[PDB]
């Protein structure tokens, strides 16, 4: 899961949109396939086709929300020539929130999602930019 | 509208039911050996094929 | 001007298995007070033998039907 | 690594799979868990007899020792849990939390 | 259980756990977490009920799962090194499976599932020493390989325990589960700090097991093992209702109680080294423990919940258990703040 | 006599009283020893006196 | 989660559909107030038989006192109600 | 009736036994001693000695001085013509300018 | 960080160089803090086990003092000594490296230039 | 040495003082059927300790000064009340049948401690074993609800279970129309509204359920009014029984060592008694609960623990 951000944070911002959004669906799809892996052996199906009808579902829900948050976030920073710009992550994170409302169908979620998400994705510019660290290699 | 209901569910309540939820889930179980070792599998694949904790 | 405190029925919160039933959870019993389940009921069977007619030991004409515990 | 290795270290991982995969009898369960102890025993044996590490040759010795403490203590339970219930299914041991 | 053999089981358990302690070649080590292993199972079936049998036989199968891992580990650092010392291992897929194999034995999520279940099948007793003794062996290992750890998984699990365990106690009602998930949030701090300082791991494990065995002490005095048991406090043992608010309060970090220096030196030594996202996710997280804290002190001090006639039996019994070393807890659990500076001694 | 039984603290244990005292004398007499001696060997080494 | 409520209308299709198996009744004249005896022409042992297997659909056990008066497909719902008290 | 409960209690009135009651207590004898206490300590003490106490701190902040220091600068600035207040806080000769 | 701190003297609860210090002096508020501590003990003792509180087992209470100072001024000795080594250690590094530790050129205000940012 | 681990392994055994004669006897039998003084005579001519019947207020007299205290430090539960009035709305009875059974239970456990301790028997007037029989007539005469009955099987089923069954059971057997002649002529009136059928419920309790179910484990002795007026005959064939059967011959020094350190424990005993189960007969308010218990604290020699009461005489505080 390191050569998929690597090859997300080593293309121009703003540009080559369609490498951008592949890498974000990988990382979408990775994250939906996770999820789906703990949901079928926590919670067994009761058929073989209940498992990867549920793998498809949110598989493909965490694949949608990779690719409209890699795509919305590619062009406002190609629209706005503005690469260096924590606004359109957080425009691109909302509008990944809202997708994940859509397919959940239910308003509040996708409310919610958009604020949260938009915050968090908004978050992740900003500690690029500054070089921020979640995990901090130990120097004292 | 304002003291009563909308800052009341954006801040406090719906950072309270997210709570509520999350810990349904996981305390959603039925004490299976079966299912919780398949887990352990998962993880043990997951920290490779993914993230290369082994390396 | 007596304060409230908790009635039965607030109490009743407090005495389920979980705190936020659910439809799963909705089934769920509390565990006994002490620990104990109940024991179950009749589980295994003795082994059914026949020890005869045509046995060494059965004179040959003895059928001795015997329940065995190993 | 030579060719032998990679068949020893595969072998553990099927028993290791296979323990954390359990079907239903809790005995099945119990013969992966020798079944590893006997892959680590022949991985440790063939790298402490290759590099003629002396006084290492007592280890797989001792590993022994303790991979039967666990079957003796691994088929109590399983005595404790047919008792019970009269088989040694595992779907019988869920009544915590649950 | 005869008398004797209880002493010589538990004084197996201490042995196993000092050998791991003082040893220096990992085939001891290993030998240590087999014979603690060995003899603590007896201690959870004691009574010989159907739950004390799935408690045992759920600890027995995790414990020794782990065991074949850690055993694997100390074989691939073998053929990579040659050599037993206990130190930094020289392979990076051994370190992987001693780090979950150590995660397993602990309990730290995602392998946390059977510590809500084997604490509720255990009396209190041997819950006492399932969530307090039996992390210092387990600890003692990361003490001497944290430079070999990696920093990715070792944080990645403290994550998913602060969180998976401040989740996990929101929906419980008894009280072993409580400090089942107590337990997997905490050793999220203590593995938290190790890779950065680990010198503030034994300080918070030292805390930790204060403020538990407290806990536990005073659970067993009356015998309560629900959250409504625990509410008929008040009409028997009114000093021990407030005993349990102070203890509870501490548990959650709130100042000046001892509960707060653990989470207080931990932030500031990720600080020093730049990790500031981190304590704070952390540190919010951590809010979660505290309310389910306070839930118990609603029910248990702060109001009065309904009683029964019979409990007018009891007022008339004197209180004949053991409660050994509970005054001399209950102090350093809550009054230590003052005497933060002392924490140097751990080095 | 008030209580129908006899209180198991009826009467003080003097076998408990005595050690307790004991105990308590000896620390304060050791730690006083101890005080005075780390003193001593404290201003010896730093050569003051 | 918790199953859905038994409901009168919900007994009425496993009784109807139970006694539809049964191959001594004619499905065409098999009505919910019709006669076993009178009816339907069924003997004593017949209207045994359809007990028994009322006792398979719903799993719980009939005593022989009761059965003597379930004469018709109308009383065995009835009497399926008052076990499961539904009232409905 | 769902559990065993006293009934609801019924306020006191403490002019019911007492006509004389200050509010303080039920005991008439200590009832007057929580009344004197208040007001000696309260009334007698805190705020009338208090009030002095603060009525004449001793220049509070040196306001009365910083008067008297300013007199004497334009008292004595004004008799030997210099500006009475110069538009530098700092000596020139002193500062480095960046270039 | 400082476990094998180029010593030996491992496993000593006060190595022979700690003697080299001031003993904590009886009158130290870190010692008679842990002293209150044991008082605070003793009355708990007497409260969960129904005994008036500042008055039952007088011997008891001046055990639960006794040993809480004894134990404390120990740990004061070694909390001392641990830190006078902190500084010990942290020192001789600069001393070893005045390289990595240079001795800084001071300017005064009147050079330093600030930018100014006013508040209106 | 309180009783414990160490008293045990220093060597203070449960079979080295129990004997052949160390019993534990029980005498049954319908309201007014001379249990009371028949058990008191076979205490004597076999030595053993005899126990008065807890009533209400037994727990009284084991603790303090053994005189009976207040009713509302009781429960408020009234035994003429239940005469009175079985079927009040207030849920006297079954509070006094849930307070009569944690009674027994307290008494029961005091045999038991005294048995094992000392070596020497004890005869008691019905048990926890016994105790259900009331219950019984009660129920089928509308005086406790469904719920009622279904708690005290709770609270039994989770205590009666650790302790051992009695050694005889001595069952004086009256019938029910003697029951009520011998109640007329017995003076309190309360007892004279007792109704024949709630007599003829404890007679069929009693021979149908307790009896069938002793024999199997317990050695029972079958008495009528005229052969229970002598007790010389009683003891005659309690001293010439067996004891061949129940879970009394397989007890030895680790089980009994269990048992001990359960019955000495009072508070341990009586834990289940009150189970947070909230029935509108047994619960009761914070309010209420609260000032009696404040009430019975300030009782003379209740404000502390036994031993460490100045007001009553008590010395050497300071120093114990
Ligand atoms: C940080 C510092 C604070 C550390 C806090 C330590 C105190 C823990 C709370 C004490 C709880 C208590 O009051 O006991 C009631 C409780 C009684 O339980 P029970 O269910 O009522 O009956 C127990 C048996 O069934 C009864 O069996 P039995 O009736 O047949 O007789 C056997 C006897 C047996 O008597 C003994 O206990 C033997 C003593 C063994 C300790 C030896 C010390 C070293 C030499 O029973 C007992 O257990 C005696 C009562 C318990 C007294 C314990 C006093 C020592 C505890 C403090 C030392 C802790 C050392 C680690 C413990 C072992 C770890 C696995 O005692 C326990 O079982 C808990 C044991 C302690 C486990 C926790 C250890 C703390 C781990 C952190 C240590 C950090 C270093
Ligand atoms: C290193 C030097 C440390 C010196 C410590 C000397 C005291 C320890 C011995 C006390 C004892 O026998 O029971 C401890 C202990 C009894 O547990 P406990 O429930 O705390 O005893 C309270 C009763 O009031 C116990 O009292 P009692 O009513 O049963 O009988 C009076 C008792 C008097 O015993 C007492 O006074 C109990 C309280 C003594 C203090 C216990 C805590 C240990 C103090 C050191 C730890 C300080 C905290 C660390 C400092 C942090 C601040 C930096 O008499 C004695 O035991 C004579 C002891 C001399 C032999 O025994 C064990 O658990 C088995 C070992
Ligand atoms: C390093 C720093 C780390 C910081 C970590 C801090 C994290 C704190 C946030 C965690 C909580 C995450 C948000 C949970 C949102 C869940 C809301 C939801 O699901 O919708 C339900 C609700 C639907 O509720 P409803 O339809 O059931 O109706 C509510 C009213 N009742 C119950 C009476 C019917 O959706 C909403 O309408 C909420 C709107 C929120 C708008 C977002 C505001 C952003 C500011
Ligand atoms: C043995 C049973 C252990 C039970 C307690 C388990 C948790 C202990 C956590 C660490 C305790 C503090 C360690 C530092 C210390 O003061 O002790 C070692 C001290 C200092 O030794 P040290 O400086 O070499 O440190 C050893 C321990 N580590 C490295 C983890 C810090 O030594 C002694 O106390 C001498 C004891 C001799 C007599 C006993
Ligand atoms: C910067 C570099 C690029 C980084 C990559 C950027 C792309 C990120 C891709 C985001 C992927 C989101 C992953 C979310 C997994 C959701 C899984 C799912 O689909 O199920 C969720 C659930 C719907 O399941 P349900 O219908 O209830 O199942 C049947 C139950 N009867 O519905 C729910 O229960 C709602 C809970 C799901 C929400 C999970 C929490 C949000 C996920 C974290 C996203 C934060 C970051 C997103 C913005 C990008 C940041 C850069
Ligand atoms: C889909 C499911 C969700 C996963 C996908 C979304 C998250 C992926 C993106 C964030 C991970 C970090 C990405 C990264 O690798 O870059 C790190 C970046 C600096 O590095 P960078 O410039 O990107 O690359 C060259 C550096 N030499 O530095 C940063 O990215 C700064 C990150 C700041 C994060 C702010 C978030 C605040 C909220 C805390 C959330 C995390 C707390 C939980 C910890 C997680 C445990 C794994
Ligand atoms: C090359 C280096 C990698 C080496 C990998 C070693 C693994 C190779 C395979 C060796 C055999 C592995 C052990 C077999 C696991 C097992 O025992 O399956 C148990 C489980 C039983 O399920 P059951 O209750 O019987 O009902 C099935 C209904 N679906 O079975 C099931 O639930 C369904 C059947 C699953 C069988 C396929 C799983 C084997 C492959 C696992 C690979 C994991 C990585
Ligand atoms: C919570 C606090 C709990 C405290 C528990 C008690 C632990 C302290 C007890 C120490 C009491 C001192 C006893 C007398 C000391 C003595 O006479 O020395 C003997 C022995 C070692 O002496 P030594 O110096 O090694 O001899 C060779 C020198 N050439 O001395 C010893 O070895 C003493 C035994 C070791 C005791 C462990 C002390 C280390 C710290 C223990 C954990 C407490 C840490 C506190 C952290 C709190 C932070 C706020
Ligand atoms: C150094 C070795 C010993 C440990 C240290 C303890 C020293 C203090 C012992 C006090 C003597 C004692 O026990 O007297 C205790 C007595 C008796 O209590 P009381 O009147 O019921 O208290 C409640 C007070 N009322 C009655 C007003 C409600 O209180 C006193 O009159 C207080 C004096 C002691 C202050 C502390
Ligand atoms: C500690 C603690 O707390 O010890 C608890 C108990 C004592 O409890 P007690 O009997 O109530 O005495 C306490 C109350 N007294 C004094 C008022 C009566 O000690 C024991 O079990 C000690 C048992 C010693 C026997 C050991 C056998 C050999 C073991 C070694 C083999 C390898
Ligand atoms: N409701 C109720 N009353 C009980 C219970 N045990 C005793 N009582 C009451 C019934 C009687 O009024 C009283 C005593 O009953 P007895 O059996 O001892 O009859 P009595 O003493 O009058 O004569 P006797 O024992 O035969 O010599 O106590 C009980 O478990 N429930
Ligand atoms: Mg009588």
Known sequence: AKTVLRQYWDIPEGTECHRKTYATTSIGGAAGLVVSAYSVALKTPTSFLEGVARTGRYTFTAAAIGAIFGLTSCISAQVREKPDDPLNYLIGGCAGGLILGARTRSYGIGAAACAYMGLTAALVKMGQLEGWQVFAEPKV | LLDLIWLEAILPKTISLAQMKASTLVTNQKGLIKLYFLSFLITILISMILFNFHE | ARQWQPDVEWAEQYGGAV????????????????????????????????????????????????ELSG | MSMVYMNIMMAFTVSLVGLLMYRSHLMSSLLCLEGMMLSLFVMAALTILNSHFTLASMMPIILLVFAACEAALGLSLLVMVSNTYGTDYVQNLNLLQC | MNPIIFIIILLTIMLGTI??????????????????????????????????????????????????????????????????????????????????????????????????????????????????????????????????????????????????????????????????????????????????????????????????????????????????????????????????????LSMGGLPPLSGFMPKWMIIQEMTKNNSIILPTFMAITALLNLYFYMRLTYSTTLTMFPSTNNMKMKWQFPLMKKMTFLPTMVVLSTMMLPLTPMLSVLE | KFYIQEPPHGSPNWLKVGLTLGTSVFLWIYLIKQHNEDVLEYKRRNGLE | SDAPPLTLEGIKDRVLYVLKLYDKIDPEKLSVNSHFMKDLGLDSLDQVEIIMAMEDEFGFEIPDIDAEKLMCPQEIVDYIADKKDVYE | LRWQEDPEPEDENLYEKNPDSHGYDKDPAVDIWNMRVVFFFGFSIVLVLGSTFVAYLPDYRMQEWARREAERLVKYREAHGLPIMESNCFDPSKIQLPE | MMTGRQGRATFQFLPDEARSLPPPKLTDPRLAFVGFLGYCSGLIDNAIRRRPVLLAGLHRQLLYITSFVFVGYYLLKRQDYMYAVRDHDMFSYIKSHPEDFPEKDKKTYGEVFEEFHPVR | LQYGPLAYILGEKATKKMTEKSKLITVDGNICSGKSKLAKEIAEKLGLKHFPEAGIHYVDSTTGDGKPLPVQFSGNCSLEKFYDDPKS?????????????????????????????????????????????????????????????????????????????????????????????????????????????????????????????????????????????????VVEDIEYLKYDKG????????????????????????????????????????????????????????????????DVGDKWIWLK
Request: aromatic letters at 10%.
């Open chain 5, 19 to 248: 050998i791991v302690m003082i040893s220096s070649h990992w085939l001891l080590v290993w030998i240590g977490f087999e014979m603690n292993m060995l003899a603590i199972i007896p201690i959870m079936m004691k009574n010989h009920n159907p739950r004390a049998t799935e408690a045992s036989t759920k600890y027995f199968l995790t414990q020794s799962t782990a065991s074949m891992l850690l055993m694997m580990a100390v074989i691939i650092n073998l053929m990579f090194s040659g050599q037993w010392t206990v130190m930094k291992l020289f392979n990076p897929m051994a370190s992987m499976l001693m780090t979950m194999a150590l995660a397993m034995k602990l309990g730290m999520a995602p392998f946390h599932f059977w510590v809500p279940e084997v604490t509720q099948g255990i009396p209190l007793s041997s819950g006492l020493i399932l969530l307090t003794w039996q992390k210092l062996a387990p600890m003692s290992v990361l003490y001497q390989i944290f430079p070999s750890i990696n920093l990715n998984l070792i944080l990645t699990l403290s994550v998913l325990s602060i969180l998976i365990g401040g989740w996990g106690g929101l929906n419980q009602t008894q009280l072993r589960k409580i400090m089942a998930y107590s337990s997997i949030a905490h050793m999220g701090w203590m593995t938290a700090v190790l890779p950065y300082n680990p010198t503030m791991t034994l300080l918070n494990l030292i805390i930790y097991i204060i403020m538990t065995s407290t806990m536990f002490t005073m659970f067993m005095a009356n015998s309560t093992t629900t959250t409504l048991s625990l509410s008929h406090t008040w009409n028997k043992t009114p000093i021990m209702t407030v005993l349990i608010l102070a203890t509870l």
């Open chain 10, 89 to 233: 709305n207030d849920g006297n009875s079954y509070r006094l049948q849930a307070w009569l059974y944690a009674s027994r239970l307290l008494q029961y456990a005091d045999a038991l401690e005294h048995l094992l301790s000392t070596g020497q028997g004890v005869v008691l007037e019905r048990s926890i074993y016994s105790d259900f029989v009331f219950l019984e007539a009660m129920y089928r005469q509308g005086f406790i609800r469904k719920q009622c009955v279904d708690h005290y099987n709770q609270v039994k089923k989770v205590t009666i279970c650790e302790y051992l069954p009695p050694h005889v059971v001595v069952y004086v057997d009256v019938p029910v129309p003697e029951v009520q002649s011998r109640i007329q002529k017995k003076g309190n009136p309360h007892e004279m509204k007792i109704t024949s059928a709630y007599l003829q419920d404890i007679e069929n309790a009693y021979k149908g359920t307790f009896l069938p179910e002793m024999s199997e484990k317990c050695e029972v002795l079958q008495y009528s009014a005229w052969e229970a007026q002598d007790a010389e005959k």
């Open chain 3, 19 to 66: 705190m936020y039933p659910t439809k799963e959870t909705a089934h769920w019993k509390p565990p006994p007070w002490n620990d104990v389940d109940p024991p179950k009921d009749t589980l295994v069977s003795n082994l059914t033998l026949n020890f005869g007619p045509q046995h060494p030991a059965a004179h040959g004409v003895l059928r001795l039907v015997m």
């Open chain 10, 247 to 310: 879970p009394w011959l397989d007890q030895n020094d680790r089980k009994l060592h269990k048992l001990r350190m359960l019955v000495q424990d009072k508070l341990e005993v009586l834990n289940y008694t009150s189970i947070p189960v909230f029935l509108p007969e047994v619960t009761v308010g914070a309010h209420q609960s609260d000032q009696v218990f404040q009430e019975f604290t300030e009782l003379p020699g209740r404000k502390y623990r036994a031993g460490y009461n100045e």
